[PDB]
Symmetry: C4
Subunit: 388 residues, 4 copies
């Protein structure tokens, strides 16, 4: 109809209720489920769907062997109905590639997929299910993007890309697209020293992205974007409640404009909702591996370098595998506020479970409640032994 | 379009004709059919569909082992086209949880799923396929609901929940929702001493629910709701034709305001149509197990403590497994009256058929005819031996 | 929109072109295809689809054992997209039963399914996908109907049923339905002595049904219906080109008002287009079994007792299995005439191929061309050996 | 809405970006994927889909044995969602036959399928999913057509057929259809000596077809059609950059009006975009087999007999199997120009990989970019060893 505008503020997050779970690995043990990774969730005005990077093979198929690898010519961004698994028969291909982002602007959807060899990748921007724009690698080193939904405001949908080293300074750009065409792009500015896989959400005409400093930071970099002025700033979450993984143990004071040191060249895509006292952080429970997952209310996390949790909710037990996590919201829901949501990728197989030769995942996602709901844990649920 | 209003009375029930049967277990022996239980049927203005609680695995899948269990993080309310089986590929997830209800109000559908551990469950009310309201456990003991469709009138859709003991007095509430939001809730009142899994239907602006007294009653409690005044009453079916299972043998006089004694802490979800002489009761044939199923015309069953059958129809032979049963009607059919319908859950596997490690079911459903139709029996039809 | 009216005459049939083929048995050797029989084809104003009586199991499934049997509680009328096979995932159940008919009246579709034991069957008439009317067995001996599409004119859709003996005189009725309700019914009149499984089509406000005299006739009975007056007549195809199976060898003169003798108590559902010189007859090639299939132009077959072929076209070789055949036309096609069409059921398995324990079929269908097209044969194509 | 008119010119082709890839053979190793060959891509105003000639069996099915053969009664033109594989469950049959073409005219789609024995084939033209016209073989020798999409302009959709010898002069005709009816047909004229499988595209009211001279030419014949005048001309691509396969090595001067000699009676369906300096040619890398695939910018290839490449892009490595290739464009995209696209059939199995008994393929397709994008190779990706 008309372009959606971020006119509402976030609803108060007093807890998280279950939104979707596909039990993909369990079900795929005996049905035609595609092997995937790098999932996310994104809504259209009339429907919300699961998204992910297929590996171009079923889990039980012999080609599942080797799916731990990230970039092949057999990957593609696919979407499928909420809480269903990604099967060969219900998965809709949005585009071909090994890194992506996607978002609806109110009128139609923009999907971006990047493909290519390491030194010659290219992004192709699709809008209304047609290819519209293409961007060639600028640093010749794995051009890559969010791996979660982008956000739009009055037709403008900013997307953060990175090209160059993952263990050194790199060339990050914020592109502002409208109807799949480039209106403008900027180099990253601010104090964030390295950006990877941004998780974004919008409220009251501002887009907040919580990303990953793969190079040095265990605290998360944050990019706040003004989609009207088409400008942005960057910093780190000040809080001592560190949210990357692997990471050092929590200090009593964090860092606002530098990476918090202790762990280099590694990290996991994650997210957060930064809204004054209504601030919640997601992180794996383990400081060593992609294990477990919890949500922590850390009032003023972004700006208070001594902020510590005041409430919390466990999502996945530390005795269960987790993985990537990101944000999305249904901007077309009824009500006066935007209900914060997120998904957690539950990785199974390699590298942690090497008795099988594949790597895949299932998805669990939650949204906020203004109630103070009882909590439960949500594991993948599959028995690797069955696959042997 | 506009909210549906219960303006018609029931059609005269002279017999029952076959409406839907999915042969799920038979078909699932060699195709991707989800393991389910707690099925039901519910109509939208333009389509009627089967519903059930998936177990998050196929019947032939190795994860089918253990599906006798009731509440896991892998369950979800799913719906699929009438008389098809619930397959991995045609099943639509309405919400995540291990207890549910759902109904269309004329404009859109409300679905409710409860999930959580035993002492910390929570219901989340979905409307127009979006989460709208959440209710936290009030008694911290398996918050649970109908397991069959709710009914709406002018936007108001009452739902009966129970929280607390299943073998003692508990905290039952009647919630009145409108567009997924709570307008009001009451504690259970009347003479019903314990309520579990209500089966409901509406006619001439009154909603009748036949439930289950798991604690002491072999006769069924009944909750009649006024969705305009948003008030209700409760009593038991007076008839000596006892309809719970397990149950004592039929007496010559029943009880109107107390459970009929003889069997404690057990029962099966069931239903009835209470309409003066046009009154029909469903019950298993066996007084000992979920075996067989028959419909009995017991004029004035609700109010006459000596009422006995005047007509009958066998649905499932006592030599075949049955299970839960509930009511639904197509409130959007043509005609001057509402045609009473019901479904019977045909449980296969555990606990009665323990040579297999799973528990699932198929569905058979009938609707009334003003004709006096010949009868046939409708078993599940699968051979357990094939699954070994 | 508006009720369709049979305002056109048939197009000139100079040959038959391929219309649809599903290769169901071939494909089903390694995919989830339902076992079926008694197929047909029927069009809606915007789509034409294949129809059949499922057996409630896949071909490779263990429950396929025994599918030679005709009436079980596991059968249902299903429809699916033209030329696709009937799979567990794309098949839409129209109703439950072991005998059926279906037709679109221009506004919506009427489907009829009969179920029950031999002495207590009942038909239930569905309209706009809802149950509307029910008819109880009148002779208590396998109430049964067409097994191919009915035809409508200004809302009136006549259907021929038979109840009683298949090897003696029986009680055949012509029902005239409108919006799923009975307007009127007649007993069979005319000279046809026994009616089974009528194949019908309409043109210029007249409905012609070519049926099967299972009792004594090797020539086919024909019922012509006036859907406005709601009256009919019956006779036999006069032609010596006998079209039932099994059958005696062709004589030089046929019979107009009596069964042509030579074979008792057996026959196959078949059809014909009776239109003066534009008359074509379908029949198996073998006079002994459901083997092969050919179309023969026999000018004035209905009324000329010495009529012999003037042109012909082989559809299936005598070295391939055939089965039932019936008529349908797309009454919503462009043009000034109705293009005659038909389908042939290609039965595989039992009883002729007993190395397998199942019985199923695939479908091939053709429509007429005003061209004189080259011919090809269209077998099922599956290798039974593969199923062993 | 209204008939589409070729009002735009081609966009400048500076490189090719990835458009679609279905990874069919990989995925089909463990899921219900139909065996196919002779694929292509074609767009409707609201969707673009993959097309191909199914073999009426899955790849893993036992009937896959023998699929190297070209014409059987089990083949059919099927279409399915872009980048999905052709599965038994998502494939839509357009018509029955072993040679086809299809195109949307703006209002609805025309599909053509030819079937029959070698000496008695016939084409049947479908429009709006209904059969409309039929054409009988004129030379009684494998009537056949494009195997890729046709193109329409103001309702007129020309199609090139060939009937007669594939290794000698034959009878090629250009038919001009409108709403599935024949407006006119011509015999082939010009200097092209033999025409097989034309690949076409349209721009500024002219339709260009790059075909295959199976008889003598290693350079490609080209048919340019005026769909308004309904007239055409024919010649060969003048360029010494030979694009058929097998073929001699490139000379320094090509031939404009005769086949370039060196290889007889063989060839592969291919294509090209002939647009002055914006001219690109596709060809296999190997001059001996259907191996590898590259795009070469050969300014003025059609008219300059000494034209050599000025830019290039590898699509498939010479160490990977390729096959047929053809053109299509989305005539309903936004923008001021038509973006040239093409697909490459990646054949697997027989005859080159004879350890398996089947022959199938997967599809990769690209479209042009005005950017100078980095290149990657796009192989089928399946391991034949897995199928053994
Ligand atoms: C039914 O459901 C309800 C609803 O969920 C249940 O009630 C919930 O119970 C939760 C668990 O108790 C509770 O969650 C906790 O909240 C704490 C904050 O609340 C308390 O403090 C505030 C502030 O003063 C008070 O207002 C309040 O009254 C409470 O006293 C959090 O602090 C908790 O998180 C911390 O502990 C968990 C382990 O429990 C860690 O995993 C987590 O990371 C937090 O601790 C680490 O991080 C901090 C900050 O740096 C460190 O100080 C600390 O040492 C830990 O650090 C180590 O561990 C981390 C992670 O491994 C590592 O990185 C680091 O290096 C160190 O090794 C927790 O979130 C809910 O708030 C509460 N909800 C409600 C509404 O009440 C109820 O129990 C359920 N009922 C039943 C019967 O079960
Ligand atoms: C073709 O189709 C038609 C249409 O269906 C067939 O006709 C139908 O035939 C049915 C079976 O005969 C018949 O059903 C019965 O109707 C009885 C009522 O009708 C009779 O009584 C009235 C009242 O005076 C008369 O008007 C009427 O003319 C008849 O005489 C029911 O009473 C029957 O139910 C009872 O019996 C069945 C077993 O048959 C039990 O399973 C059932 O539970 C009922 O009996 C138990 O319950 C009562 C009440 O408490 C007890 O008194 C009794 O002892 C039984 O109790 C034991 O068993 C129960 C259950 O196990 C247990 O809980 C308890 O503790 C005790 O152990 C039955 O419903 C249809 O009405 C009739 N329909 C029509 C339209 O005619 C026709 O036969 C078919 N044709 C062919 C050729 O087959
Ligand atoms: C390319 O394609 C074209 C287009 O299809 C091919 O041309 C077609 O060729 C067809 C086969 O030749 C041909 O079909 C036949 O037509 C005959 C009628 O035409 C002839 O007679 C008329 C009338 O005088 C002439 O006008 C005309 O010029 C011809 O001379 C039919 O009579 C044929 O059917 C009979 O034979 C077939 C076997 O071929 C039987 O299966 C069939 O049942 C018919 O014969 C039985 O029935 C009759 C009637 O009672 C009996 O008299 C006779 O003895 C047979 O009876 C026995 O067999 C039956 C069945 O088993 C059994 O019940 C009974 O008891 C007895 O045992 C046949 O239909 C097409 O018309 C023709 N089409 C066109 C447009 O030309 C062309 O060949 C192809 N090209 C190539 C290169 O292959
Ligand atoms: C990142 O991505 C970019 C973007 O893709 C990469 O840059 C691209 O690199 C490509 C490969 O180098 C390049 O493709 C070539 O372009 C040549 C034309 O450019 C050159 O010549 C022009 C003209 O003077 C200059 O303007 C220009 O500056 C260049 O110098 C083509 O000529 C190339 O094709 C020929 O070679 C390939 C093998 O490389 C053959 O397969 C192909 O068939 C061509 O050669 C055959 O055909 C010709 C013509 O008849 C014969 O003369 C020749 O002998 C060969 O003939 C034999 O082989 C054929 C086929 O087997 C056989 O039939 C015959 O009988 C003989 O046996 C090639 O297309 C892109 O243009 C370039 N793109 C851009 C934008 O720059 C970049 O490298 C990537 N980066 C990294 C780090 O990898
Ligand atoms: C088929 O015939 C009936 C007439 O018998 C047509 O019905 C008339 O249609 C118009 C528009 O619907 C009404 O105003 C008339 O009263 C209708 N009916 C009768 C029964 O008189 C019908 O429109 C015809 N069908 C089609 C497709 O033209
Ligand atoms: C393509 O060209 C034809 C004109 O040749 C356009 O047809 C005219 O369209 C309008 C609206 O449909 C009619 O009133 C004219 O009479 C049409 N036709 C002719 C043949 O004169 C057509 O609209 C054009 N297509 C598009 C998408 O614009
Ligand atoms: C931070 C992005 N990088 C470094 C290039 C990664 O390796 C990502 O790591 C992971 C990962 O789980 O750590 C998954 C993604 N598939 C990778 N992205 C790409 C484009 O390969
Ligand atoms: C009466 C409801 N209760 C007691 C909590 C049950 O155990 C139900 O029993 C049965 C049952 O078949 O008896 C099935 C339901 N899955 C159970 N419901 C829940 C929420 O677990
Ligand atoms: C002529 C109809 N009769 C006799 C009842 C049949 O047996 C039919 O035979 C055949 C048949 O292939 O001969 C198939 C049908 N499934 C049967 N119909 C029913 C209702 O069982
Ligand atoms: C050039 C067309 N001809 C000669 C008849 C072919 O054999 C084609 O060859 C090939 C081929 O891959 O060479 C595939 C097509 N399936 C064939 N077409 C038909 C109609 O059989
Ligand atoms: C395939 O067919 C050939 C030829 O009929 C036969 O020899 C061969 O054994 C078959 N192979 C398989 C695997 O069926
Ligand atoms: Ca399988
Ligand atoms: Ca890090
Ligand atoms: Ca009880
Ligand atoms: Ca007979
Ligand atoms: Ca050639």
């Amino acid at each position: 109809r008309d372009f959606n505008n971020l006119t509402k503020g976030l609803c108060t997050i007093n807890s998280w209720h279950i939104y979707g779970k596909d039990n993909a690995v369990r079900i795929g043990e005996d049905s035609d489920v595609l092997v995937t990774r790098e999932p996310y969730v994104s809504c259209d005005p009339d429907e919300c769907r699961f998204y992910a990077l297929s590996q171009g093979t079923t889990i039980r198929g012999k080609h599942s062997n080797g799916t731990i690898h990230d970039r092949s010519q057999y990957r593609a961004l696919i979407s499928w109905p909420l809480s269903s698994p990604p099967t060969v028969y219900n998965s809709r291909v949005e585009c071909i590639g090994w890194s992506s982002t996607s978002c609806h602007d109110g009128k139609t959807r923009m999907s971006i997929c990047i493909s290519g060899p390491n030194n010659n990748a290219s992004a192709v921007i699709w809008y209304n299910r047609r290819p519209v724009t293409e961007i060639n690698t600028w640093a010749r080193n794995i051009l890559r993007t969010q791996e979660s939904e982008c956000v739009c405001h009055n037709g403008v949908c900013p997307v953060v890309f990175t090209d160059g080293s993952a263990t050194g300074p790199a060339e990050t750009r914020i592109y502002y697209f409208k109807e799949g065409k480039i209106l403008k792009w900027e180099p990253l500015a601010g104090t964030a020293k390295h950006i990877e896989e941004c998780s974004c959400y919008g409220e009251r005409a501002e887009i907040t992205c919580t990303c990953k400093d793969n190079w040095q930071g265990s605290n998360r970099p944050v990019i706040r974007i003004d989609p009207v002025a088409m400008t942005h700033t960057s910093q780190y979450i000040c809080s001592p409640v560190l949210t990357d993984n692997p990471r050092p143990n929590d200090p009593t004071v964090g860092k606002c404009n530098d990476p918090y040191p202790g762990n280099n060249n590694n990290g996991v895509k994650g997210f957060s909702y930064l809204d004054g006292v209504n601030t919640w952080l997601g992180r794996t429970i383990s400081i060593a591996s992609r294990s477990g997952y919890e949500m922590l209310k850390v009032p003023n996390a972004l700006t208070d370098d001594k902020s510590k949790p005041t409430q919390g909710q466990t999502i996945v037990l530390n005795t269960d595998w987790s993985g990537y996590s990101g944000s999305f919201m249904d901007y077309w829901a009824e009500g006066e506020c935007y209900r914060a949501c997120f998904y957690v990728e539950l990785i199974r197989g390699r590298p942690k479970e090497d008795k099988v030769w594949w790597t895949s995942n299932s998805i669990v996602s939650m949204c906020s409640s203004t109630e103070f709901l009882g909590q439960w844990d949500w594991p993948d649920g599959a028995k690797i032994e069955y696959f042997l």
